[PDB]
């Protein structure tokens, strides 16, 4: 047998940049892994229908869906952004398709699609993560510096804890015009703060990086705190061999050997996996469950501007929302209301001057054993 | 002027009512209450002009 | 306050305790019910004007 499924990625011209990242590779990679593995689905074939859109820019993003539709798919991967994403949501319940949801979007239960699962780490586990390891260092100042608001939005147990926990910070955006804050390093240096904690992403953490090494910034009395896991393509070691007390994060699970030959194996595909590598593997994975656990269901040419539809997208947006499967990241879970990664394992790795070590764990199962 | 309602978080509806406009004809749209259906033709408004 | 993304724009006053040394504490609404009592309950001990 043969199947075929709808992707979408998001790039700076899109169709039309012709970029393939380590997702889309990745998407390839596990595919044909599918295609490799016979006891992942008797006969069933992983074919799939790429379509790259823009970066924010749903006009293009409804072009390539119903491209998709009158190709036929049975569910389409959800952007990273809702003016693309929640359009798609609205097309995969008004259709009858499973919307996927690869990352976090901030949806509302307002919203009134069916088809529907999230898939990130609880929010307010993670915020009574900090709590639990906050609480276990007994401070009070800090600073939490934030270049948007969602990253309050995603830790807002911890902004009710002023209200619980006895702590205060300074809440500060970044520039929104400029990446190097180093002007406001020097300017937030009239606060000297040495617990700053940090909503970040790579390559802003190494602009980041080069900003705190290069404001004296970078030892072993500034207790930091960062978010980003992506250790292999930005700099380490004159940061390691200054001396730094600092945490940072790994979702992955890759003393699995299992796990760390996929990783290897991407490397020798791309480059190490990063999160949304073993996020997508893994996601590739679950279909291949959630399709292998399902009857082999028909593929449906459907127009975009019609009101016609799949016989099958509720049975499969059931097959999907109750999907449980450990994977590359340790557990992967749905809730069955509003779907959530509720249950997560985490590797608290952190830089020290003999160089990244993974010093202890948090789960909402395992609490903060470290 | 041309009205239409259409339920909160649906661009399916978005996308029906846009048609309905586009080939009746409009050149202006006044903005729903939800945002994926806003942002979504304001994108479409944007590349059509 | 009670929605939490309209204070994105207003965030003037949200980073103002950076600048104007006023002391503040947060709470949101409660959003599944629209019963502040005990709330208001809570803001009779936290007994502010």
Same mark, same amino acid.
């Given at each position: 047998?043969?199947?075929?499924?709808?992707?979408?990625?998001?790039?700076?011209?899109?169709?039309?940049?012709?970029?393939?990242?380590?997702?889309?590779?990745?998407?390839?990679?596990?595919?044909?892994?599918?295609?490799?593995?016979?006891?992942?689905?008797?006969?069933?074939?992983?074919?799939?229908?790429?379509?790259?859109?823009?970066?924010?820019?749903?006009?293009?993003?409804?072009?390539?869906?119903?491209?998709?539709?009158?190709?036929?798919?049975?569910?389409?991967?959800?952007?990273?952004?809702?003016?693309?994403?929640?359009?798609?949501?609205?097309?995969?319940?008004?259709?009858?398709?499973?919307?996927?949801?690869?990352?976090?979007?901030?949806?509302?239960?307002?919203?009134?699609?069916?088809?529907?699962?999230?898939?990130?780490?609880?929010?307010?586990?993670?915020?009574?993560?900090?709590?639990?390891?906050?609480?276990?260092?007994?401070?009070?100042?800090?600073?939490?510096?934030?270049?948007?608001?969602?990253?309050?939005?995603?830790?807002?147990?911890?902004?009710?804890?002023?209200?619980?926990?006895?702590?205060?910070?300074?809440?500060?955006?970044?520039?929104?015009?400029?990446?190097?804050?180093?002007?406001?390093?020097?300017?937030?240096?009239?606060?000297?703060?040495?617990?700053?904690?940090?909503?970040?992403?790579?390559?802003?953490?190494?602009?980041?990086?080069?900003?705190?090494?290069?404001?004296?910034?970078?030892?072993?009395?500034?207790?930091?705190?960062?978010?980003?896991?992506?250790?292999?393509?930005?700099?380490?070691?004159?940061?390691?061999?200054? =001396? #730094?007390?600092? $945490?940072?994060?790994?979702? @992955?699970?890759?003393?699995?050997?299992? &796990? !760390?030959?996929?990783?290897?194996?991407?490397?020798?595909?791309? =480059? #190490?996996?990063? $999160?949304?590598?073993?996020? @997508?593997?893994?996601?590739?994975?679950? &279909? !291949?469950?959630?399709?292998?656990?399902?009857?082999?269901?028909?593929?449906?040419?459907?127009?975009?501007?019609?009101?016609?539809?799949?016989?099958?997208?509720?049975?499969?947006?059931?097959?999907?929302?109750?999907?449980?499967?450990?994977?590359?990241?340790?557990?992967?879970?749905?809730?069955?209301?509003?779907?959530?990664?509720?249950?997560?394992?985490?590797?608290?790795?952190?830089?020290?001057?003999?160089?990244?070590?993974?010093?202890?764990?948090?789960?909402?199962?395992?609490?903060?054993?470290?």
């Amino acid at each position: 047998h043969v199947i075929r499924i709808g992707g979408i990625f998001e790039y700076a011209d899109g169709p039309n940049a012709q970029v393939m990242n380590a997702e889309e590779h990745a998407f390839r990679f596990s595919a044909n892994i599918i295609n490799r593995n016979r006891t992942l689905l008797p006969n069933t074939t992983l074919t799939y229908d790429i379509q790259r859109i823009h970066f924010h820019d749903s006009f293009e993003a409804t072009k390539k869906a119903c491209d998709q539709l009158a190709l036929g798919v049975v569910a389409i991967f959800g952007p990273s952004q809702g003016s693309t994403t929640n359009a798609v949501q609205s097309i995969c319940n008004a259709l009858e398709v499973p919307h996927i949801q690869l990352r976090w979007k901030h949806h509302p239960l307002d919203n009134k699609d069916t088809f529907y699962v999230n898939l990130y780490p609880d929010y307010a586990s993670l915020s009574h993560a900090i709590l639990d390891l906050v609480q276990s260092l007994k401070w009070r100042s800090a600073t939490v510096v934030y270049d948007d608001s969602t990253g309050l939005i995603r830790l807002q147990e911890l902004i009710m804890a002023p209200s619980r926990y006895n702590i205060r910070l300074k809440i500060r955006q970044l520039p929104i015009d400029s990446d190097d804050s180093r002007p406001l390093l020097k300017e937030m240096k009239r606060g000297r703060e040495f617990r700053i904690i940090f909503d970040c992403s790579h390559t802003m953490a190494a602009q980041i990086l080069k900003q705190a090494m290069a404001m004296g910034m970078m030892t072993e009395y500034y207790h930091f705190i960062f978010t980003t896991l992506d250790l292999y393509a930005l700099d380490l070691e004159p940061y390691r061999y200054s =001396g #730094v007390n600092l $945490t940072g994060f790994r979702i @992955l699970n890759v003393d699995n050997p299992h &796990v !760390s030959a996929i990783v290897e194996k991407w490397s020798m595909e791309r =480059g #190490v996996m990063m $999160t949304d590598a073993a996020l @997508l593997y893994d996601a590739v994975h679950i &279909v !291949s469950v959630t399709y292998q656990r399902a009857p082999q269901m028909t593929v449906n040419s459907l127009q975009c501007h019609r009101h016609k539809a799949w016989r099958f997208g509720g049975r499969f947006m059931n097959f999907i929302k109750e999907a449980q499967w450990e994977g590359l990241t340790g557990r992967i879970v749905f809730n069955k209301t509003s779907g959530l990664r509720t249950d997560f394992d985490l590797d608290i790795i952190s830089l020290k001057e003999d160089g990244l070590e993974k010093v202890g764990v948090w789960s909402p199962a395992d609490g903060l054993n470290i």
